[PDB]
Symmetry: C2
Amino acid sequence: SILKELQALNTEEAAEQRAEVDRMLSEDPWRAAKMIKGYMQQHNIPQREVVDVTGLNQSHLSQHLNKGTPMKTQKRAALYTWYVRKQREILRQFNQMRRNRFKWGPASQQILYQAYDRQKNPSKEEREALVEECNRAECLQRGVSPSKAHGLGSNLVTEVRVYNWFANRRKEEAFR
Amino acid sequence: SILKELQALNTEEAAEQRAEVDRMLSEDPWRAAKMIKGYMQQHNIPQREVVDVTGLNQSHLSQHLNKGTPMKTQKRAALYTWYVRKQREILRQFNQTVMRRNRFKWGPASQQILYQAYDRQKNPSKEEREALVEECNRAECLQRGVSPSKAHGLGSNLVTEVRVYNWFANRRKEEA
DNA sequence: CTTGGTTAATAATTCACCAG
DNA sequence: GCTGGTGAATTATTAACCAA
């Protein structure tokens, strides 16, 4: 334990981080905010996934990132840290507790919408197209190759997904 | 106890409420949604109160009531009763008289004139605000067709200084 | 006092989903 | 090609604090 406590703080990664997150702090709070939200949104990552790991208040965080309501250093610092980490965390997850709910990214949405002008009930196969069409796209966004889209992981597209997405779509419209 | 149970089901008032709501369910679903959205809108009742008292899924109600997504009968029936009761409920406490506590909600009225009095004086001093407490408060009473007297019936959604207070401030604070 | 941070609550939306 | 009903999670937004 304290021996891992330390055995953590010391790697070249650890340091690399302690210090990137350090300039983030010296720099403009907001310009940082963008970046991240940037980030988050490139990879589609639940805001929740961040409160959870950082323990910052979720409304506090939503605003300082969507609105720049100022966050006191200590906190920021946490949040930056999160992000720098997850940036490797996210990194290996390719090149190399709660289980996140999937989300349509706008990219896949784009297709889906386009593809859907009078597509009530797609053929369990036409579906399949688009599954494989989406992720191909979703990788474009995150700056890798279609080759393996398995890193998308939590937000990996599937049948049943577009499935419902039709389906729900065909209810959506269905009223007003 | 079953004697209460019975003595309850069996009132002049009560009984007729069954009738009213029973007719309501013969009507166009969305016409009642309309009705009620409105009614609540008027008295400013939390969507959440309904959700407890009735015990319907909170999203389902936001739909069936905004989107007008279809809700099976029973649930409806459970709504109309609600709405129904409430109505006497609201008007006892109101018209004639002298596990968790709702929460305040500013109403367009109160709000309108708030945003006027605003681009007019960034920081109202107690007297100042105080005026407004009686402005809204009256206006709130118009809305629900009653007397500026005993705007005391507004109850929760009753306006106050400190309440007006923070309504500046998160009006002030919010221009960053 | 008042800002300045920070918050618990509400509710529109989003995704899933099972029983006819 | 299940398909209407519903429902848990999510996150922008609201209305209040408490610390200095």
